[PDB]
Each structure stands twice: as structure tokens, then as C-alpha cells.
Ligand binder design. Structure first.
Ligand SMILES: Nc1ncnc2c1ncn2[C@@H]1O[C@H](COP(=O)(O)OP(=O)(O)O)[C@@H](O)[C@H]1O
Ligand SMILES: Nc1ncnc2c1ncn2[C@@H]1O[C@H](COP(=O)(O)OP(=O)(O)O)[C@@H](O)[C@H]1O
Ligand SMILES: Nc1ncnc2c1ncn2[C@@H]1O[C@H](COP(=O)(O)OP(=O)(O)O)[C@@H](O)[C@H]1O
Ligand SMILES: Nc1ncnc2c1ncn2[C@@H]1O[C@H](COP(=O)(O)OP(=O)(O)O)[C@@H](O)[C@H]1O
Ligand SMILES: Nc1ncnc2c1ncn2[C@@H]1O[C@H](COP(=O)(O)OP(=O)(O)O)[C@@H](O)[C@H]1O
Ligand code: BEF
Ligand code: BEF
Ligand code: BEF
Ligand SMILES: [Mg+2]
Ligand SMILES: [Mg+2]
Ligand SMILES: [Mg+2]
Ligand SMILES: [Mg+2]
Lengths: 322, 314, 321, 321, 303, 304
């Protein structure tokens, strides 16, 4: 009975990934819903008294790579509560009955450590609409999930069941009834893309301006957040390729701060960068040409049919996440 | 053994018969089946036998577990709210011993009532499933549901199921009373809004509740509850939109108003202490915004499958 | 935990197949990307700090038999890291809920032995777009890979997930999102074919020149690397066939026997069975044996699979030279 | 561990069926290729040192009943090495993730006994081009085969994957790349037909000569080796039919009795049940029984699958002749 | 598993009878013959229209050979699990070679596979190829084990399976003497007044039927007297109370039921020609006409 | 899983079905009554299929045959065999035939032969081939006297043709008639206190054309609870004979309040009426579709 809690104690993370609300570019409706879900019942407990109850479940859905796990990291950072990060490897067991006793002990620990947050990434693996799947695991896990979510003699009060999935239409109808907040996280718009570029570039010394970031956001038409992250990564790795595949360096302005340039200048010394020791390194600064080359190299991942499926799911049972 | 100390609840959740909006036939059937053998014990003897099996079904989120909570509140009897988690073990034979001792304790604690939520977790139709944990448990439940001569006085089995066509036909025939819980009508919608608002101050009238129930076309009970929750949370969002606060009348009860007024004290909202914030009142516009936000959680395929099931086994 | 680690301890290869970067011909973009993402964070760790992070996953796709596993062998040789080479037999198990703990313990061992490189050959078998596959094991192993790659409470820093598949359009969209660099490995051009011929012939005694290698590389149009390897193997096997059909031997220059035309100076007419070892002299390689091997062995890949690979490249990939 | 080896120990054959290389008619190129690839690394291992490596997989395709399994029996006879005869029932299992472990254990058992031969009969039943078949079985078994043949951390040196199929155009492109030599086994010609007649007549008493066998081989054009074997068996059973369907008998010259016409020298009428042992003499063979068997049994090969086999040969095939 | 049907109980099918007789009797009775190149037949396909005594002839060979028999069917070698419908065939051939010499009877070989055209490709290919490897293979050495296959549709088989089956014997429609002999063995030991000319006219009338059709019309003509005993009134005491049914109203037509009739005294009426005429006028032929053309074509290119 | 009993159901205990009983009785009872009639190649029926819409008590009729043949009744449900028992089912079908052999004269009753035999083209291996392959072998057990198999089906159209063919004799069990429905009402109320006359019973009979015994049973169970129903829930009440029974507004001595207001055991439950059942008839529709008379009669025409 204690080995179950010892196995489930590895699902409570204590690393606290530093993702703040200013790190998330856009998604103001989802951020406001998560704020009124977690920040308010701990900061202002004198408002949720009587017939006013907080939210008891939020389903984040959308295209792959839009920021659902990033909002989960931001909630785990700024929640100041117990965060349960479970998956299909922490609930399914080899024996018989342990696959439901683990879920019962997980919800018992979540109710014992209230206020607590249960984050189940990829809820479509556990809830497979119980029509054709494996009888034992599917039926028992889904029914125990329903009973531990509301049930009769459980009274789940103060816990939050976060869920992030890419396939929202393959959920069970009872699970979709349990998740009382269907929040659609879409692909980012122009202002969100420009703020995401401003966040991902950071304190790197570059000649880019706000008009340059605006033209970059206008260029990335249909990109996702991971695609913006990898074109920022490619544009940041571009000065390393510039300092690798070039010769005829030149000391600019400091203990020989030498920089690659055109062959033939005021001191175009023909040597290699491997002989250059550290801290006499003046790499070329970022321009718009490196980000244009990163845009030309890296291609968008999300197609234009899954967007139609997510749009049909929003018009069927979904809200908007701005 | 002693592991069944969590199947019975001692909380008694305060859900009375007036809280259950609508469902008059199911309410009166559960009422007679839980009251009349305790009210008039001479009425049930021999031929005129009471109901020993009650099954509830319909769309998901219509009031099955709510009716079970109402029975557990206004029954005055031992409630056995147990599911498939406390019936299956790692060993062999203990999965039958659990059901045997469960029915033994339920017969020893007469008058009792056993409520099995999601009974399809025990009825996998034994196609190619787990033998020792499916078929033997199903036959044990079939021979322990043979209390038409054994448990004439005492226990009563219940059932709540969202998907009732995937159910074993033997236990379906053993459940003699199968009541279909439908989507609520307009009067049930209006009294459900009246119950869910409750003692919260508002300006909503009976005509406002009637047009709210007319706007909710095809909504369910949980959808009505989360619409009421969103309408309750909307004045907190209006306070969070803090601009040009204004004091009303005791001991500095502030209230935000339109930008540009008489006495528009432009300040924040977190600088003020508690118990002096006169919150705005519930209009109909926040309710209409919650209606436009919240979507119905049920589809048309489940409704036609429920219609097929009730026309096949009404 | 310890049983799964004892089962997964036979996945770290300690063989180190000696394939260097000069052995691979062509594929300059794939070479440069693998070179930075393998060599640079373990050689110069002071550069990758702050906003600069290395590549966390590289996918190699193309027609069958182009050099994806050869590039993986070169990475495993020149990586100086704990090279994890898994497939669909080390992860899938018989019991219930034991295939996910295998992947979790694999990624835990990769994080415990960082810097590490995970090479999953034929990723198309594990990931099948989770549309109509076998529900429990398929969807759970896909969601377990998706959680263990980046996830929330994992923070995979230092590991690398290499992929090598022949059919990349059957990959899941989230898995294609995880593989942040799709590198297309195409059919080789004339300089790469000439370099592969010079590498595969190598130190063999032959009279072949640069013009002969250029004509061979111009002749093998549409061929692949395995086809070049087997025509070099057939051209090397042909002197043993000439030794088999070697009537009228001729000892030219400790009695090194050499076949010739029937009837010559010193035409000792015998067979090669009675001739003992450590004195044989094989005939030299000419361009005629290689032309015979080219006329004997056909190419493997056709011209519609290349169209599908180019379609996937222009839709969701980059050109890897 | 013990279960997989106990299940795969039955795949090794030790009976050694005696079929020599002279028992196969024709197929000179296939005979030469199989002869070198099974004999030369076993007999003379000093010829393949470094740059020259033997063949690592041979596909024997063609029409059904052409001598593919007979050629595999000849290789298993004069191989002098370990022979693995696997099929679909020995690799495919009922449990989840058990067939891939069986293929891995099969190749690991074959690598411990180098040199070894793995004769996967009917590779078309285990390779279905990964297009539309069963997801788990198809993708996982084909992926385990593609990884286990060469792979990265395998180093398959000293093995040979012999494959015999009838529909080679329904194979995967990666599997066709894996099989190096795709040798065509075409229909036999006149010389192979006469050689099959000369080896199928055996040592039975007959009056047939070389020109008789040449005329028979000219008459059986459009047939195959199984058809030649069944007309030889039918012509061998025709004198037993003449024994059984006869009433008038005759003792010629310890009672070497033979049937006769009704009315002869000593036309004794009795039965073969009354005929005891060591006294029965069969009638002699002639061209009439062979012509009757040829006119009695019809061929089995059609004329469009031969065109498809010729198309696959012209696309990606060698010549066995 | 041993039936009790000898050679004489099968009517007609002379070529199939002599072929099976030599192929399963010649090695087991004369071991001094099959030496050297003389090998027995290792496969026989018995096709044709259904109901024409194929399993009856298989039981005749199972009786008269005095050897071990295996009488599995198509549904026995088809499972729902993945890769379990081939280990059954492997264990079948293993237990056949364990008790050599043996006879293997496989029914509905057209329904065992699906000629890998449109059905389940994985299961079809694995079943077919495992059947072929268990038939000849490489290290399977099937000597003395006879594969006796029977089917109703031969043209939906595979080229490799029809190559593995050596002698493709056709079971045709029965003839006049076969129909009369089938009537004579189907009527049994019941008290009858039927003659050989009556059997000849019956067999001339039932041209185009099958053996199962002849069996069920003999069963109908045998059940019709005990049907007319029960479904009749106004019985007649002929000649210690021998009662016989007649028309209502006769020379002493006693109207009663069969409940008050004493045991071992009720006169059962003998069956006549009109019962068989009613049976043949009631029963219709079952076979089609294009299947005979398909059998003609199959014999025409695989005679 | 296998029931066994020496039942005591006479022909007269089975309402109606006189036409079906006479043919079935002559087929089975005549053989048993006068066995000397069946020497040689004349052999009694040993398979009989009973088919017709549900709610006709095909089971009850089957027990009557057993009672009248003076045989042990052995019985099994095919639905249970196929689902509940699952694998042990082969063993069960065996043991069943084995018991019956050991206990001649005896009768095997297989109920819902349609829930077992399903044409074997798409069924699962163990239940399909094993369950449907063992029954057939056993019904060939006539050849290896003394036992009879009676199959029961509601949906004969859905009955495996192979199984179908083992049931030489087929007998249609039709829906009930006026006299029988009248008897069913009487039996179903039996001793219960009520004021129904002989004529009321006939009325109830006449008013339930197309109902089955089952239907009538459900309707009667409903009606008998009406006086309890009235006593439990009444707006106003009234003293009689002190016992307060429910009465309409402003009845003689009509005091309105609620059942809750009234003392326990002094509450008067309403008396039983013929009219009240009429209520119950309206709220229970018949079970059996009207196309059944033809579908069953098609079978009587074809295999009767
Ligand atoms: N909306 C966003 N705002 C900020 N960063 C983002 C956003 N979307 C993606 N990213 C960046 O790209 C990564 C991919 O997003 P992630 O949280 O992994 O999405 P997912 O839930 O699909 O797994 C993030 O970790 C972050 O670095
Ligand atoms: N008849 C009803 N009266 C009041 N609220 C109801 C009713 N039916 C549904 N609801 C609302 O919807 C919820 C659904 O009922 P609940 O017992 O939680 O689950 P379920 O109906 O799925 O068993 C209730 O908790 C309540 O908030
Ligand atoms: N690009 C290449 N550069 C050098 N050698 C190559 C190349 N492509 C193929 N080869 C040669 O052909 C063989 C086939 O490549 P391999 O790694 O097996 O490819 P795959 O990934 O398809 O399994 C290599 O082992 C090598 O000998
Ligand atoms: N060239 C040949 N020499 C000798 N026998 C042959 C030859 N070709 C075919 N046969 C005979 O034909 C039969 C078919 O052999 P096999 O290779 O098993 O055909 P397949 O593999 O196509 O089914 C063998 O029994 C063999 O004796
Ligand atoms: N030619 C025949 N000779 C003797 N009996 C026959 C003949 N044809 C059919 N029968 C009888 O008909 C019955 C049914 O035949 P069956 O074995 O079902 O045919 P098949 O073998 O084609 O399935 C058998 O019991 C058999 O006795
Ligand atoms: F890939 Be993410 F979880 F949408
Ligand atoms: F209808 Be509820 F979800 F039980
Ligand atoms: F491209 Be290879 F065959 F993996
Ligand atoms: Mg995510
Ligand atoms: Mg509920
Ligand atoms: Mg590769
Ligand atoms: Mg073969």
C-alpha cells in the first residue's frame, strides 16, 4: 500500500522550469482562463464561497507544436501548488487491479495535497472512446478516471485536471463532458509571431529593429512556435558557420578581437579559427539576412487539413483561445 | 474483509428531492422503491413484490449520479457506492470473495442499497476478454442478483450507464426496471437555472429565466451548471477590469463604473482590503455571453443510439 | 527497474565500426549538420550558452540504399559518446504496460550517460500517424515517445534522436514536429559516384586511372551506393572466375602463376586445383571487368518513389545535397 | 532466452538430404553463383581478405516448380555448413512483440555458428512492400528483417540469406536492395529436359536411347521440372497398371512370370494376389508409355505470368540460364 | 477415428476407386515393388459437384488401408490469433510423420485459402505458404504420408497448390447403375416390395440428382408410411386386432386414434412406388448449370 | 449451467397451443407409448425445433412434453453457453448429452438455438467452431434410442442452416387466444384480493389481442400494485369501515392532506378493480411484431 505512493512520488516534479507569463507570446484568453483557474483560488479565497466554485478541468487542444506544454510549464512555474505530471507509463501496471489502484492513489494524493494540479499530457492515449479498444485496460481505466473525476463519493474540490492533446475528436464523450473548458490553442498571428521572435532572440547583440521583427513576422506566414524557435536557433548558429567557413580575419578595435571579413583588407591575416584561443572572439552580429536564410531553409510542419479538423472541433464543442 | 471500509460513504451529500430538476417518473419510481417498503411494509408480500432492480441510462451528464446522490441523501439507509476498483484483486478467488463478502455485508446491514456506477466496466460481453476477472465475476453477480426469493427484504441494486447497448444481456434481463433519463425540457431548464443561481442576488425575472431556457436548446445539466459558473465568474472579471472605481453608500463599498462619471476615483483593485468591494449585479448579458461561449457537449449520434436502445428495450 | 536495465544493457554498441567522414561521398549538408550537432557541443561547450542551443533531433530520409545507416555509422565512430542503437524489438514487450517503461528507462539511461546519441533505425514502424493502428500498444508507445522527447518534466538536454526511414510520409505529424531538421538523402551525383568508386576499389592493385573512374561514374546513371558496392564486389570477384577458367597457365617472373591465352611461352597446361596457396598472382583490374559488372547488375530504385521523396522534401523538408 | 532457443532449435536440419549438383539440370549461372558463394569462403578463406567480400544474400525467383527448393536442397547437401530452414510458422508468434525477438534470436544463433545459411522460403509471404497490409505484423517483421540483415550494430559476416519466391514484383524496394543477386530461374530448354529425363529414368530397365530422350525432350516443350517428374512417375506406374489390369499370364524361361495377350504359349489365367513374391517380372519400358503420360498430364504454367517474370528480369534481374 | 465403410459401399466412380486403391494399397501390401525410383503418389485432389461421395470415398480409403487417419476440415485450420493457424498445420504434419504411414484428409481446400487476391493477404499468404512448405519443403521429408484433398470448387485454387496435388481426379455426376445401386444401399433392410425394374425406372426418373438427394428421398419414402400411420383416421380391422388405416367409410371403418391401439399388433403398411413418385415430384434438383461447364473446363485443361 | 428436472406440467397446464401440442405429442408421445411400432428402419423423431415469437412459454410446453413422455427434462440456454460459460462450453454440451444418455427416457432442451448457431463464416474460433461443431456431433448421437432434442428459437430465420437441418420436425408456437389470455389473467392474479367477475376476466382477455403470456404477466404485475400506489400517494383521503383511503376532491368525509399526514397501518390501500387493469393494458404495449404470424406461418408452410 506504501509502494504505490513510493512509485507515484516520482510524478511530482520539483525542478520548476522557469517559464513565466511574459515568456508565452499570445494566447491571452487561455492565459486568462488559467489565471482565473489557479491564481485566484489561492490569492483571493474570499470570493469562491457559497454557490461559486472554481474550474475543475481544462482541455487544451490544437495543432502539434502550438504551446500547450509551454502553458503547462508556465502553470507549473507560477502556480505555487503541487503539480502532478503523469502519463500512460505511470498508470498502467503489469498486474491486475494495480492499474486502477494507481489512479485511485494518485487522486487520493491529489486530494490530500490540495490545492494540487494534475496534468495529463496526451489524454487521447488513455481515453479511446471505449468502443473497440482493449477491454480490461480501456474500460477499467476510463471508468476509474470518470469516478475519480466526479463520481459520487469522492468530492473532487480544489484539484485541477489539465489535459493537452493533439487529437480532441478521439476523446470519449464522458471525458469531454468532464472537461468543462475546451480551449483551442491556434497557430500564432502576426503580433504573436513578432513577440515570439523578440523573446527567442533575447539579449544577443544584433542590428535588428522592430520593423525588422515586423517584416520577419510578416514573412513567417503559417509557421508554428517550434518552427519560430528552430529558425531562431538556425539564425543564431549562422555566425558559427560564418566563423567556420571563412578565412582572412581582421582585428577590429582589446587583446586581438579578430573578425572574419572579405579576403583582402587592412590586416587580412590568413589563418584558421581553430588556432584562435578563446576570449579573443568577435563573432559577426545577426542581421536580417541570416533570419531570411533560416526562413528559406526551414519549412512549416503543420498541414492545412488538421487545421480543418480543429476548426470543425471548435465549431462543434470548442471555445476560442485568441 | 476489512478492505471494504471505503465502499460505504458516511458523508451524506445534501442533495434533496427538490434539487433534482425534472425527471418526475424516475424520481417517483426511486421514491416508491426506496420509501414504500420502509413506509408500509405490509403492502409488499407475496405477489405484489417490490422492485429489486433499477437501471438508469441516457446521454452522459443528465442526472444519474445526481439521482443516486439524492437517494443516498433522502433514503435513510446504508449506501454501498462501490465500483470495479474494489472488486478485482491481484490474486485468484479473491475477486469472487470480494463480491461474496460485499453481498454478505449488504444482507447483514439490511435495509441497504447497492449503487454500481458504470456497470459496463463489469460487463465486457465476454467476447475474448479476461476469463477469471470477467466471466466468473459476471456469473457471481448473476447468482447474487438472484435475490428475488432470497433478498425480498433488504438490498436493492442500482445502475448508471452512459452507453447501455454495450451491456450483457443476462444482467440487462435481470435489471427489471430500466428508466431512460432524457435531456431536460423547458420547465426543468428554468428550475435548474433557479436552483443553480440560488441565493445569489440578481435582477433576472421569470421571463428572463424562460428566455434563458428557450436559448438553451439542447443543453444538458452540466452545461447549465458551467454556464451558471461562467455567469458567476463574470463580475470578478469586471472587477479585474479595474478602471474608475466609485464608492456606493456602508464603510466605503466601492464599485467600478463607466470611464467618466461623478466621483470616478481612478485607482487599482488590489490595493483595497477585503469585505468592502460592492460587486456588480448579474444582468442577462453575461448569461448570454456564457451561452455564446459554452457549447453543448452532446452530439446527434448518441441521441439516435439512445432512441434505438429505448425503442429496442423500452 | 533493474530487469529493464538488464534487458536494455545489450543496446549500447561497444564495437565502434571504423567508418570515417571521408568514407562517405557527397551529402555535404547532412555532413555539416551532423558535424555541428555531434562534434560542437562536446568539443566547444562554451559557445552553446544562453540563447544558443544544439539540435535535439535529426531525421534522415530518402530512397532505400543511399547512406543513412552509413552516416549513422560515421556518427557512431566519430561521436565519442554512448551511442544508443535501438529498434522495434528492444522497446516492444509482451506484458501489459511494460513497453512504455522500457522507453522511459532507455531515455533515463541516455540522460544518465549524457552526452549520448539515440539512433532509432526505421522510425516508420513505431509511429504510424495513430489513425487506425492497434490501439493500446501503438498509441501508448507513440505518446510515450512524444512525452520522452521534449515533454514537460523531462528536459532532454544533451541527447540526440537520429532517425532513418525510407517512407517518411507515414510519420506522425507530432513526431515530424519533434524531428526539427528533415534532411533528404538523395541519389548521388557524378563526383560522389567517382569518390565511391575510388573508396570501394581503394588499395587494390589495378591499372584504373582518373579518366576510367570518370567514365565509370558517368556510366552508372541512376545507380545507388549499394549498387556501386555490389558492382565493385563483382569486379573484384571476376579475377577469381578467371583463375577458375585458367587453362594454359604461364609462370611470369618464386613461381607466381598467371593465366593467358591457350598456347603461349611457357604454357603449362594444368588446372588451379593442384596449385597450392601463397604463390598465386591474380590478374589486374581493367575497365572491361567493371563494364561487365555494370552490364550485369541493374539499379534498384525506380522513378516514382523518387517523385514521392521529392514531394515530401518540397512539402516539409530541406535538401541535404 | 531458453524458450526462444528451444523453439528455434527445430529449424536447424541435420538429416542432410542427398541431392548433388549433378541432380539439377541447366541453370549454369545460378549454379556458378551459388557454388562460389557457398564453397569458396568455406574452402579458400584467404582469397577474400579485406577489399573483397563474398555475397551476402541471393534471391532465386521464377515460375513455380522450376527447381528453386531443389537448388536449395543441393546447397544444403554440399554446403558443409549450418543450414537454417525457416518459414512463416516458426517466426510469427501470437504474443505482442514476439516475432521480432524470434528473428533476432534466429540471426544471433546463425552468427554464433559461422558460416551459416538461412533459407527463408517464400519471402513474399513475409514481405508485402509496407503499403496496405497488417500494421503490426507487416511493419514490425519487415523492420526487424531490414535492421537484422545489415543494420548498424550487427556486422553480419559469414551468413547468407537464401530466398525463393514466385511473385518477386510484390516485394519491398528495401528488401530487393537487401538481396544482392536476383537470379532468374527460367523454364528449361531442350538440353535440360533431356538431362532431367536421363536423371529421372534412374537405373530401371528400359530400351530408350539418346535419340529417344532427345525426341522426348523435343515433345515436352512448354513444360517444367515437376511436369517431367510426374510424367516419369506416370510412365513408371504404367507397367504396374499393365500388371494389375491383366488376366492372362505367362511364365517365361525360378518362375519369372509376366503378363501376355489372351492366347499365347502357356496362357495361364490367374491373379497377382495369387502371384507370390520374388517371382513377378514387370513389362519393359518403351516410348509409348512416356508418350501416353505426356498426353495424359497437362502443363500448369500459364503465359502471362511468364511475361511478368520477364519484365521483372529485364528491370532488376540477372540471368541463370 | 475409424469408420466402417468398405470398397463395395460406394456406387460408381471406377477411375477414382482404382486410383485410390492402387495408390494406398500397392505400397502397404507389396513392399517389394516400390524400390529405387518407384515412389507412391503423394497427393490426390478429389473435386467436382458437392455431395457426390467424396468424404464417403475418403472414409472407404480410411477403412481399407489399415493405417492412421486424420480427417480435419477447413474450419479446424482457421484461427483468429495472429500466426496460430499455421502451427496447427505444422503439428498436424508432425503427428502425421510420427505415425507413418498416414493419410491426411483436408476438406474444402478452396475455403482454407482465399487465393491471396482480395481477402486477408497476411493470413492467406501465411496459410498457403505454410501448407506448401509442409507439403514438400526442404527438411520435411514427407515419405509415406499421403495428402488426400477434397473440394467442391477447384477453379478457385492456387497454381502452386494444384502443382502440389499430383492426381487431380474428377468426381462426375452419377450414372444409371450408380443411381440404382445407391437406391439399393439406401433402402436398407426395411420390409419392401420393390423390384429391380422398379429401381431401374426410379433411377431413370431421378437423372440429374445427387447422392445426398437420393439419401433424403429414401429417408422421405421411409418416413412416409409412419407419417401416414399417424396422420390418418377411420382405421380398419383386417383379418387379433390387426388395424390398418383406410378411407373414411369402408367395410368396418373403426374411427379411433393410435393411442388405444395395442403394441405389436398395428399393421404397418408396406412402402410402394407412389411414395417414391411423391418424393421425386416434391424434391427438386439443387445444382446449377454453369458449374458443370466450369467442371468441363477444369477437366479440359487439367485432365 | 445445466438444469435437470422431472417436471410436473400436464398438457392442460399449458394455455392453448392445442394444434402444436397434438402434432408434437403424436411425434414424441406415440413413440414412447407404443415403442414396438418402431422396430427396424422406422425410427422416432429425435430433433424438434419449436419456433415462434417470444413470450409463448416454449419452455413450459417443452416441460409438458417431458411430463407426458415421463422423461427427465435437461435444459440449457445457448445465450449463456455463448457468453457466460465461454470456453467450458464444449465440455458443457458434452456433459449435457452425456447426462441425457445416462437418464433415458429423457429430453434435452436448448433455448435460443439462434444465439448459438450463426452460419460460421465470420464467428470467432472457440465459441463459433467449438460450440456449433460439438452440438452437431452430438445430434449425430441418435445413431451411436432414448433421447430427444427440442430446440427453441424466436428468430428461426437467424438459425444456422446446419443446425436447422438437424431438427427434422419443426413446430410453430403461435401467439395466445381469448380463452388462454383469460386463463392467464386469472392465474397471474391468483389469490390476490380483487373484485373482478368472470365477465371482467373475459373482458381483459378480449382486450389484449396480440399480447403474450409474458406481456400479460407484466400487465398484471403492474395492475396489482395500483391500490398500494393509491394509498402511498393521495392529495385528499377519507375514513371508511379508522382507515383513510384516497378519494377525489370533496368526497363524503373527504379530508385532504397527504399520505405523510396519516398514521401507519390506518392507511387504506385501494381495492382491486377490473377497470384498473385496463389502465395497465394501455401502459404495456405487446412485445411481438405482427409480421410474426406470417414469418412463423411461412415456416409452418415450409418445414411444418
Ligand atoms: N506560444 C508559444 N510561446 C512561446 N514559446 C513557444 C510557443 N509555442 C512554442 N514555443 C516554443 O517552442 C517549443 C514547443 O512548444 P511546446 O510547449 O513543446 O508545445 P507542445 O505542447 O506541442 O509539446 C516550446 O517549448 C517553446 O520553446
Ligand atoms: N436534474 C438535475 N438537477 C440539478 N442539476 C443537475 C441535474 N442533472 C444534471 N445536473 C447538473 O449536471 C451535473 C451532472 O450530474 P452528476 O451527478 O455530476 O453526473 P452524472 O449525471 O453524469 O451522473 C450535476 O452535478 C449538476 O451540476
Ligand atoms: N553516400 C555513401 N557514401 C559512401 N559509401 C556509401 C554511400 N551510400 C552507400 N555506400 C556504401 O554502400 C553501403 C550501403 O549503405 P548503407 O549504410 O547500408 O545504407 P542504408 O542506410 O540503406 O542501410 C554502405 O555500407 C557503403 O559501403
Ligand atoms: N532442374 C531440375 N532438376 C531436377 N529436378 C527438378 C528441376 N526442376 C524441378 N525439379 C523437380 O520439380 C520439383 C519442384 O521443386 P521446387 O523447387 O520445390 O519447386 P518450387 O520451389 O517452385 O515449388 C522438385 O521436386 C524437383 O525434383
Ligand atoms: N457415390 C456415392 N456412393 C455411395 N454413397 C454416396 C455417394 N454419393 C453420396 N453418397 C452418400 O451421401 C451422403 C452425403 O455425402 P457427402 O459425404 O456429404 O458428400 P461430400 O463428400 O461431397 O461432402 C453420404 O453419407 C454418402 O453415404
Ligand atoms: F506537439 Be504539441 F503537444 F501540440
Ligand atoms: F452521465 Be454521467 F457522466 F454519469
Ligand atoms: F536506405 Be537504407 F536501405 F536504410
Ligand atoms: Mg505538448
Ligand atoms: Mg454519473
Ligand atoms: Mg539504413
Ligand atoms: Mg519452393
Amino acid at each position: 500500500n506504501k509502494k504505490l505512493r513510493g512509485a507515484l512520488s516520482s510524478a511530482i516534479l520539483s525542478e520548476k522550469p522557469n517559464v513565466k507569463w511574459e515568456d508565452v507570446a499570445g494566447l491571452e484568453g487561455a492565459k486568462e482562463a488559467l489565471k482565473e483557474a489557479v491564481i485566484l483560488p489561492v490569492k483571493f479565497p474570499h470570493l469562491f464561497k457559497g454557490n461559486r466554485k472554481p474550474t475543475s478541468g481544462i482541455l487544451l487542444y490544437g495543432p502539434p507544436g502550438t504551446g500547450k506544454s509551454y502553458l503547462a510549464k508556465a502553470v507549473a512555474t507560477e502556480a505555487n501548488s503541487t503539480f502532478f505530471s503523469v502519463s500512460s507509463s505511470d498508470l498502467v501496471s503489469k498486474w491486475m487491479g494495480e492499474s486502477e489502484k494507481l489512479v485511485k492513489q494518485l487522486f487520493a494524493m491529489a486530494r490530500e495535497n490540495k490545492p494540487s494540479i494534475i496534468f495529463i499530457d496526451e489524454v487521447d492515449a488513455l481515453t479511446g472512446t471505449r468502443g473497440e479498444g482493449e477491454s480490461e485496460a480501456s474500460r477499467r481505466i476510463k471508468t476509474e478516471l470518470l469516478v475519480q473525476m466526479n463520481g459520487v463519493g469522492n468530492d473532487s474540490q480544489g484539484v485541477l485536471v489539465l489535459g493537452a492533446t493533439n487529437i480532441p475528436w478521439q476523446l470519449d464523450s464522458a471525458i469531454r463532458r468532464r472537461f468543462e473548458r475546451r480551449i483551442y490553442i491556434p497557430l500564432p498571428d502576426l503580433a504573436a509571431r513578432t513577440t515570439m521572435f523578440e523573446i527567442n532572440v533575447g539579449d544577443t547583440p544584433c542590428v535588428l529593429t522592430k520593423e525588422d521583427y515586423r517584416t520577419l513576422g510578416a514573412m513567417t506566414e503559417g509557421y508554428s512556435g517550434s518552427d519560430i524557435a528552430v529558425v531562431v536557433k538556425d539564425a543564431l548558429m549562422q555566425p558559427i558557420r560564418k566563423i567556420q567557413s571563412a578565412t582572412h580575419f581582421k582585428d577590429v578595435s582589446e587583446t586581438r578581437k579578430l573578425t572574419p571579413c572579405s579576403p583582402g583588407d587592412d590586416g587580412a591575416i590568413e589563418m584558421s579559427w581553430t588556432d584562435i584561443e578563446a576570449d579573443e572572439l568577435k563573432e559577426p552580429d545577426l542581421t536580417i539576412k541570416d533570419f531570411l536564410k533560416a526562413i528559406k531553409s526551414t519549412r512549416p510542419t503543420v498541414n492545412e487539413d488538421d487545421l480543418l479538423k480543429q476548426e470543425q472541433f471548435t465549431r462543434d464543442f470548442g471555445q476560442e483561445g485568441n
